[PDB]
Amino acid sequence: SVQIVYKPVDLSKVTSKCGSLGNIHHKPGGGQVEVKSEKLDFKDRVQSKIGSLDNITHVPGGGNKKIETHKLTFR
Amino acid sequence: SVQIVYKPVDLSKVTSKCGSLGNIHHKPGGGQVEVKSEKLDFKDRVQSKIGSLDNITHVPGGGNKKIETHKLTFR
Amino acid sequence: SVQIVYKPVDLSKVTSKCGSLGNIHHKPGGGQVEVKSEKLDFKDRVQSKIGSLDNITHVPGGGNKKIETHKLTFR
Amino acid sequence: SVQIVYKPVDLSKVTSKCGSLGNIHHKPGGGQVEVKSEKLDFKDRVQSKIGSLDNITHVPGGGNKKIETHKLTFR
Amino acid sequence: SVQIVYKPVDLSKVTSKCGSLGNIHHKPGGGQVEVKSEKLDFKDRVQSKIGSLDNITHVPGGGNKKIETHKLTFR
Amino acid sequence: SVQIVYKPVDLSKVTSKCGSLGNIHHKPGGGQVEVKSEKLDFKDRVQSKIGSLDNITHVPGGGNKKIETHKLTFR
C-alpha cells in the first residue's frame, strides 16, 4: 500500500521597488535659462528641448516574472 | 491500495512598486525661461518643447507575470 | 508499504530596490544658463537640449525572475 | 477697516482597528478533553467551563473621542 | 486697516491598530487534556476552567482621544 | 496697516501598533496534560485553570492622545 502527501507551502514574496521612492525635503531648483537664436539655417529635421528643470522618473524596469510548476507522476 | 493527498498552499505575493511613491515634501522650482528666436529657417520637420519645469513619472514597467501549473497523473 | 511526505516550505523574499530610494534633504541647484547662437548652418538632422538642471531617475533594472519547479515521481 | 477670514480646514482622520483583522490562513485545533468527576462536594457557588477550543475576540477598548472647539471673539 | 487670515489645515492621522492583525498560516494545536477529580471537598466559591486551546484576542485598550481648539480674539 | 496670516499645516501621523501583528508561520504546540486530583480539601475560594495551550494576545494599553491648540490674539 502507498501514501503520497503533497503539501508544498509557498509564503514567498517577490517585490520590485523602482524609481523615486521615500524621498524627503527635496527642493530641486532650476536656474534661469536664456536662449538667443538668430539667423540659424536648418537643412534637415530638428528636435529641440529648452527648460530650467527636468524632474523625471522613467521606469521601464519593475518587471516581476514568477514561474511555478508542480508535477506529480504516479505511473 | 493508494492515497494521494495533493494539497499545495500558495500564499505568495508578487508586487511591483514603480514610479514616484511616498515622497514626503518636494518643492521643485522651475526657473525663468526666455527664448528669442529670429530669422530662423527650417527646410524640414521641427519638433519642440519649452517650459520652466517638467515633473514626469513615466512607468512602462509595472510588468507582473505569474505562470502557475499543477499536473497530477495516474496512468 | 510506502509513505512519501512532500512538505517544502518556501519563505524566500526576492527583492529589488532601484533608483533614488530614501534620500533626505537634497537641494540640487542648476546655475543660470545663457546660450548665444548666431548664423549657424546645419546641413543634416539636429537634436538639442538646453536646461539648468536635470534631476532624472531612469530605471530599466527592477527585473525580478523567480523560476520554481517541483517534480515528484513514483514509477 | 477690518477683515477676518476664519476658514480652518479639517481633513484629519481618527481611526481604531481593535480586535482580529486581516488574519489570512488560520486552523486553531482543539484537542480531546476528558473530564471524570467522582464523589465531589461543593458547599458554595460553583462557576465552571469545559471545552476543546475558545476563539474569543473580546474588544471593550476600541472607542474614539474627537472634541473640537472653535471661537471667534470681537469685543 | 487690519487683515487676519486664519486657515489652519489638519490632514493628520490618529490611528490605533490593536490586538491580532495581518497574521498568516497559523495552526495553534491544543493537546489531549485528561482530568481525574475524585473525593475533592470545596467549602467556598469555586471558579473553574478546563480546555485544550485558548485562542483569545482581548483588547480593552487601543482607544483614541483627539482634542482640538481654535481661539481667535480681536479685543 | 497690519496683516496676519495664520496657516499651520498638520500632516502628522500619530500611530499605535500593539499586540500580535504580521506574524507569518506560527504552529504553537500544546502538550498532553493529565491531572490526578484525589482526596483534596479546600476551605476557601478556589480559582483554577487547566489546559494545553494559551495563545492569548491581551492589549490593555495601545491607546493614543493628540491634544492640539491654536490661539491668535489682537489686543
Q: Which of F59, F69, F71, F73 to mutate to test the interface with E (most CBs of E within 10 A)?
A: F59
Chains that touch F (3 or more CB pairs under 8 A): A, C, D, E
Q: Which residue has the cell 501598533?
A: F17
Contact E49 F54 (CB under 8 A): no
Residue among A1, B75, B8 at smallest CA distance from C3: A1
Judging contact as 3 or more Cβ pairs under 8 Å, the answer for B and A is yes
Is A64:A14 a contact under the CB 8 Å cutoff?
Answer: yes
Q: Count Cβ atoms below 10 Å from residue A28 Cβ, excluding itself.
A: 22
Contact B28 A55 (CB under 8 A): yes
Hey, is B31 helix, strand or coil?
coil
Contacts of A66 in chain C (CB under 8 A): 66, 68
> How far, in Å, CA of B27 to CA of B31, rounded?
12
Q: Which residue has the cell 514616484?
A: B20
Closest CB to F11: pick one of E11, E22, E47. E11
Reported structure resolution in angstroms: 3.1
User: How many residue pairs from chains D and E have C-beta atoms closer than 8 A?
Assistant: 287
Tell me how many degrees the CA angle B28-B34-B40 measures, rounded to the nearest 5: 135
Query: D4: number of CA atoms within 13 Å, CB side?
Result: 14
Is A33:C50 a contact under the CB 8 Å cutoff?
Answer: yes
Give, for E72, the enclosing helix (H) or strand (E): strand E64-73
Contacts of C11 in chain F (CB under 8 A): 24-25
CA-to-CA dists, residue B25 to B48, D12, E53, F9, angstroms = 31, 18, 49, 12
CA-to-CA dists, residue A9 to A12, B12, E21, F23, F39, angstroms = 9, 9, 21, 16, 50
Residue C68 distance to chain A (closest CA, Å): 5
Judging contact as 3 or more Cβ pairs under 8 Å, the answer for C and D is no
Method of determination used here: cryo-EM
Contact D24 E27 (CB under 8 A): no
